[model samples]
Target chain A: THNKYKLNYKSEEEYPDLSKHNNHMAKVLTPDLYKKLRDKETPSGFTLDDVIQTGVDNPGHPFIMTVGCVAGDEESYTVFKDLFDPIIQDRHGGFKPTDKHKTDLNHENLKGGDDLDPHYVLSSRVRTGRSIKGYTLPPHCSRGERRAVEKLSVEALNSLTGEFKGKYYPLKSMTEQEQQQLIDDHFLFDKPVSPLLLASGMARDWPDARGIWHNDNKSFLVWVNEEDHLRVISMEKGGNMKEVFRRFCVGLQKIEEIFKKAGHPFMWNEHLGYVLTCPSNLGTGLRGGVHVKLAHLSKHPKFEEILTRLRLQKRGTVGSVFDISNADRLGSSEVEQVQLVVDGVKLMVEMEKKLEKGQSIDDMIPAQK
Target chain B: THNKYKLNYKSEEEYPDLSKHNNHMAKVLTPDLYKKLRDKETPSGFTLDDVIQTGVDNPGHPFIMTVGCVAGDEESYTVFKDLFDPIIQDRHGGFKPTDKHKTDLNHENLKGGDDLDPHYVLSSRVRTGRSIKGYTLPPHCSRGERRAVEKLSVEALNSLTGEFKGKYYPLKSMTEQEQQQLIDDHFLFDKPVSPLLLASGMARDWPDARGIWHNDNKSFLVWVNEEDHLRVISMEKGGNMKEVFRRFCVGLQKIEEIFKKAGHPFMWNEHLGYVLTCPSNLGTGLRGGVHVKLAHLSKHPKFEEILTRLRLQKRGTVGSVFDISNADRLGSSEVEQVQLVVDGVKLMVEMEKKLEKGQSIDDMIPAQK
Candidate 1:
């Protein structure tokens, strides 16, 4: 149970409950929408596990505090865009995420292939959970529902005729090595949410209804019926934040276009952002950041505090290498949050240099984690 | 204005209204169904054009009859196996079609590298409309719905890691020559429902959402969002019903397996058989048949009557050659209906040979047309 190397052994109680904000959102929702959630129980009548498991897996996820806590109902809590976008930007930065953010994920924008800075960062990735519009969120979905999501998502991913054309690999029956490798390379969602999903009834069909889709190079990817109907992603080596955002933007946009062209769209609700199993990813549901090594600040007492101030979360990826992701997707614009991480990474790089020089590291202290 | 060579130049007034049958089906449906249909309207709120236009265009089409009449109660009403299978078989032979009938379109079971028998039969074909379960049928669908159906169905067909792995051709940019070739060779659903589909709302986007998917040999295929959400097809150049059926079985089964594995399944209704836009294709939508000269019987008054006697109908291919097909899909089992066509074809061949020998052909007696 104490296998720290495995990124395992955490329980729901061990983590902070990030889902409370959603329930609060439900309460303040226009026309008191929380009742709708209660009235529409899935056939299995088991909805708590999805929220429970994800909370346990990602205990300190900031969606609840920053965005989820907003009683979207201030204007009766239902007028989504007018009320929601500002709350996040006001709390984080002046940046208001625009529709143009959708274009940042293209391979064209995913530049700096070999020119990326490798000093402060070990790897870079920008990912977000996206649920297909008009489907039952995984928590309430049946095997049939999950299957439909998996089937259609794979179809959309493979439909990309250009460089992003992908290959689908179902998690069912996958050997530990095969499963681990994809996640190890960040091509798929690792087991962090796997067990919790099964307990929550979202993974009713298990591997059969779950799959990973990645482009030939494994850079652009999607996870189907994982925590959400789809998880669009873009990543690369070193600290090339703009490049990572570019790839994600293009890949996700292509996928979104395909889905819309086919009559299926991402489950986007105006007031709720992207309708999903969990409330944390309510607004843009865009979690963008890079995997980095802050070895210099690892032992610093103020490390965690710096991250909090910058609005970033240091999530451990493989072994000790932690991923510094925009902690609160629900709050702030995509660029603002991503910019925070970007600015934070540069600050860390400066401080890392001071550690070697024994210079006054106190000056670099307040920059970012 | 009249293209005699095509399934062309048709209007609603020129044809008998075939949709009256749907009103009849509405009678037996459970409560709340009719209300559901009324409650759910598409953007244009006119899904009738889909069936009405297709039916008005191809007045004699098999799918415009039988269950196409049923008004499904919202609970759900659509399904398909290699469903449309026997409808074509019985119209050709009195041989009851078994599960073997499902394999005809497959190249493996459809083997004949110049070994085909072209004397009595000029060509053979089997086709059925398919919809994915859990999605709206074409009639109730939005462009996104049709697109999803088209994209996923093609994926299943192309997923075959066998000889059947093939290419996809969207009709949007296809040249008339390319379109003509596919139609001439019977590799896709070419003409029958073209204009009518546009008239009915079923083809609002026209070629933009339409495409054809087939294996290397063009024997097995799926016409995506053409006349219907999906048209599973198989054909050859001879009267080998069994071989055709065997190929279809293999091809369809393989495709079905792929869909199932992906969590996408063929749309099926417990009582309705298969879900499709046309109510007539509600049962096993399988349509198996062959094009034969029938020169000997062409002039005989009893020839057309003979086809009627066995629940078969006579339609044409490219030229004046006739395609004998199962007319009544609801009355018999898949094997029985298919058997009727097989036996009927054999009887026609016997009569053709007798006429060649200058012998009296009156003894051929009564059989399906």
Candidate 2:
């Protein structure tokens, strides 16, 4: 039954050289390790070449971007455990091989900031990637499997009610202009321009089974056949982090229920919170972010230092508007990840206020502990 | 932290005679086995004597009622594996020690008979037991922990909305007559009269932390600090098994969400499915039954044989109405267990209808396969 899906590569003989490659894979995949794992294949026939193709093709992206590994299917994580185990630990903040990941979908358990100063905040979004178990991931999935993912995802998305009621827009039928419009509005993901995505064959079927769904209020969104099988998201203008997180929790659960109703649940591993395409997204697959006007703070002497201390990533910057989000996606509960972002953003805003008042903020900064 | 609770017995010297117990514990716990496991204890201080006290107190009930053992806490199952492994496998229909249990809460996956003749069916009820993980099981829990269970349960139950929205009626506050009224109406569980409950110390705290919750329509009910920490139930005065099962699934999930929000999820083990006070109720912790009218077939010579083959338990009989429920509670998904009961009842009805018309049921009987 697993043979229904084929691997992206034919064999391990086509393994690439990593002398100049600098991703996590290059750092971890030593010659002896390569010899030990090169011939292994998951039940779906996914190979080491299939796992590292993206990293091999594009070696320049940061370790986070390339992550340097993708699981062809859920079993890929196990079949090539020799590889995934270390990569998972390194990428997931020292989450060891023996450490089990726990998932807490309790939105009420979140101690997120609901009282963020809206004047300095633009919008807040928290999204997590989910993959359907027993199906090959997008990068190695066949066109039929890809279409099946789309069908199941859209069915689940369409069932959302109340504040999450929405419709799906398949890229296959949409004009490029409409696609570009959605991308410009930040409602849809751009085409697979990332060397990681393109090189890994995640874009093989392209628009055929790809689409986006957004609620009527445009607060909840779902991206089908994206980097992961499903990228469940909750977003809204201004910084009501609690509301965004609440919606994310509720919406993700609803989709999970729908998928369960359809006889397919999201991929989950005891050691890896929720399974996804990339090792970096193994645990929670959560990214909670805010686009804030950090004007003075963006250029502060310790701007990068602050984010590092808070374990946040500075995504992009336009003028003083910086896209800041939690950097680590694995080894934490969904609520905890969102809480970190919410708490981090609050601290940033507090510092920004201090800076605006011409006050020295060095003493106000928290210790790493 | 776990030492907050204490074991029922002090040491191995107190090991009782199982030679005459005649229950699952007696059958599985041999002299050699007792020598091997008599001193074992779980983290919560639960011991081998604590596990089998109820069965030793009274050995008259069949294996079902006196499954002969209870867990002091979740880890008791692991600490006393030698005795429990065989007993669990026998009671759960040959569920192996190595076999993993899967829980599927998908109500839509149920293939139940919803078109049963009203004249031939009285009412339908489906319920499952749930234990709060990290807490001591009712039998060995401290009074403070028992009160904590009641508080958490009532809070979760009160938060239920829609058809499941209802109020909690604490047994501590309700008069004995009022309690009897609810018990007579089948809206509440009766006091633990079984030797299993009495000897296991399950009834020590009794009404103090025990309570029942029922919805406005009285179809949905919750039993707190009863046989299990929570016995979530759904029932109605008709044989709409679909409706009953649907309520069971939805209501169970809602209560589960409430528990999760409170930072204490249900006790679940990868191999055991849902942990419970008793080993018999481990997997899924479900019993889906119907108060059905079998009429002439109830007196058939092959009545017990038919039930044995169907894995149905005939709880009690009043006139022609037999309380029929699935016999095995463990080793299967929730939906699958309910399906077995629903399908078994349909077959029994078919046999009854055939017998009413003087048709022979010998040929109608299905093969064991």
Candidate 3:
């Protein structure tokens, strides 16, 4: 907390060569600005070195691989605004520094969510990351803090009643076969495979306090101490996106209530909806998508362009199946983020249908960003 | 910004005598706690003295008189969390430190707004305070900052279209007759007359950047550079509480949009909904009320207790008419706050009707908090 304005980092030779990096952090962290913030630290002693260590170690990541660095503590965002602000703005699609994030959970406002063709849609899922307030971000959080979070989350999850009632399974106590079964069903999370997370110290105390929880129907799920403190999830086998989103909203709100009752609400800020370790996952922290077949449209030359204009992102999953989710997250509300995916996927399916009949689909494209 | 925990104040004799003051600050700021925070200051140089100056000068305010002190800057809330957290909790009716304020503006969420009888009710009004981020609060703002706020607000107000279209009138250039005329019509704000405000430097450079704006119908109003940065208001001369609240929500949201477009969003925190000069005005900052003639019920021995149970606050306005608004602010959403006032007033009107008929109304009272 000292404002002496002195650079304690004397060895310039030890500084990371960020000249080849193309992230917002590399673009904004000029030598002069670096010197000014090099000696600064948050209340938790999270330093400039801690913030940029991952980016320095993993400089070869693609431009699309955001969150080259992580905020070890909530104060890291404000303490190092000079470096974090531009990165956040760029990653969140022009969510400006002065913009305050608003959250809306009302499921009634969503529209046009009916599946264009149910046969092509396999499943629908919506998930978001949530970090508890007063705890360090995962990258710098202590082992004891991680245990505390695990204990708190399971207690809250167990207290959930009716459709949300469930039991927790800590990885340390679970069998390998059980873990693999959960993984096979897409209900469990694996260890940090991304070098960005590994380099940021997120996997320092691996599988210590990590776990997953799901209801009897496996429709609602929660992953604790994996990337984020908690990743609240809801999904179903078919493309009833509205019902999936409704369950997510209700489950997430109930989990928030449980934490509040236990004396720790989710960490949040006006400028950032929900505080997450990675800047890319800030704001609503929502990633709602559908697993669908788009074989014909995926081969089209304008497929990617159409998806980009519609604010959608596609990840290849299995043969002829794509996992499509909304691209923009931080600037919008929870409902709005899901609505984008719900509406966008419907359009893609329609275009795919036209392509199946050997008809041009260019006229069906949506407007640009 | 030094974290050195050394006491900077050597003159213990100059410390204000707060032994007799019974506000939350006096209770929480034991000698030990005071010594610990005495040397602390926000980034804006707002100090412990600056925070407690108003409270110390006027120590005789009733227990109902919240906001004994003001936060000169947003950081003051966090820098002096030891002092603010308790006051905010007590004043907001047990809103704990861990509680995060949520806002809901959907008018359709409201229910039970039908007027039982129209004769007893006169009018309805809902108003809330808003402060733009990155600007010092009114009590501590410089003249130049005040002028900047005035310019920004009027420009935003002028840009309002449709039913919200309006003009601004600065007090500096307006005549006494014109000001009084607006006041008589309930379309303008008078200068601060409270001793606490005067002691806190809120009245400095009287009326320099102060002004008011109203729509063509005079139902929507905005007071610039008042106790807070802006007081957005919506009112009508009827008992249609739902309509009045809807208008307030729309007008306030549009104004917020204007500010967000100008790159200076409203000052807000997760723990506190909307930041204000006074801690009492934190959270939703909403005051929704109705003017009603509660003639016979006002004389009942348990009238005050009934109001307290219903979470309602009554103020003597004119003749036999009383201004009744929801008592709790920071703990509830804007829509919830308005709902409390609407429901509570209806119950009061019912109780008054019973009293006129010489019937007991004990069973009509609500459950206690």
- A79-175, model 2: which lDDT tens digit per residue? 8888888887777779888998988999899885687789988898888899987568887775456677888888778877889888888875777
Q: For residues B1-369, write the lDDT of model 1, one tens digit per residue.
A: 001111121222122233333322322322233222322323323322222223332333434532222121112221211222333233323323242222122334222322334787787767777666645555445444556566677777666766687888887667788788788766655433443233233433334457888888777877787656677777776767666666676777787777777777876644445555554554567676878777767777777677777567887663347888777544344455456667777777677787777787776677323
Which lDDT value does model 1 have at B163? 61
Residue B99 lDDT in candidate 1: 25
Model 1 CA lDDT for position B131:
68
TM-score of each: 0.39, 0.48, 0.49
True lDDT of residue A207, candidate 1: 47
Question: What does DockQ give for each predicted structure?
Answer: 0.01, 0.00, 0.01
DockQ order of candidates, top first: 3, 1, 2
Instruction: Let me know the DockQ for model 1.
Output: 0.01
On TM-score, the stronger of 1 and 2 is 2
Q: Kindly give the stretch of ten consecutive residues in candidate 1 chain B with the minimal lDDT sum.
A: B1-10
Angstrom error at residue A179, model 2: 4.1
Q: What lDDT tens digits, residue by residue, belong to model 2 across residues B120-222?
A: 7788888888999757888777545667788888887777778877888887678788788797878876566664575566664345578888998888888
Per model, the share of native interface contacts recovered reads 0.00, 0.00, 0.02
